[PDB]
Design a protein around this ligand. Sequence first.
Ligand SMILES: *C(=O)[C@H]([C@@H](C)O)[C@H]1CC(SCCNC=N)=C(C(=O)O)N1
Length: 268
Amino acid sequence: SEKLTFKTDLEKLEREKAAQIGVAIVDPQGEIVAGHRMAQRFAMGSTFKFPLAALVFERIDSGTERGDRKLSYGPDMIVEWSPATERFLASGHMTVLEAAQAAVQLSDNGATNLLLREIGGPAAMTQYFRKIGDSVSRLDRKEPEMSDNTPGDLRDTTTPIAMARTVAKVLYGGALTSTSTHTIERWLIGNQTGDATLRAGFPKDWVVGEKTGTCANGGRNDIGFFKAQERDYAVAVYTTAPKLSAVERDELVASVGQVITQLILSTA
Ligand SMILES: *C(=O)[C@H]([C@@H](C)O)[C@H]1CC(SCCNC=N)=C(C(=O)O)N1
């Protein structure tokens, strides 16, 4: 059984790395392909920045937001890990689209908070999840405190299955216009922060786009999509490994990518 090998290989990684590995793989319609701890809650960390950009694109599609609108800010918006926000600070603004692309591709915290200030904060992010059929994911705080990952805390969490289904809804389920869907897909493919995580474990001819996260207390996450030939999939991986180094956590997620690959290739 290929799915049994998938489960066994994930459980070996969990034992050997003292880790918990949550995974869900779904098809474009949200049907389950495989998973592990798929409805256990994990802290989202920066992975929510992908749904945040989808919310922004919904508003652009609708006309309630404009992509080229200039969002003014001062140094009060610079927080830990704000590389683009810091570069644009002297100019005094980033556009909605610039901020969204920095949030997705650089995980820029200041840019993320700039967008949260505009769209209604964590409560509005949570309402967007509900609107697109996700009753599970919740944003309660802005960055970086939303990544605190205090053991047992349900704030700022999702589950692998709920997030994978949200990814599928955004990329394949008609949440966005064809133009906005293509734009956000390209942003995920061009992500700058994921070279050592999931896409390091997938074949080099698969089209892969994803959004990483890192949370305190050992959280390392990666969500997105892969296309194996003509077959599209949405995927969400959330891991907790408090005893590993940062590099070993990257390698853990890459290993999960290989375990996913072995399943997908064998089930053809
Ligand atoms: C997201 O989880 C955090 C945010 C909550 O503080 C930021 C910090 C790291 S930065 C990754 C830099 N990549 C590099 N070479 C991420 C992340 O995407 O993992 N997001």
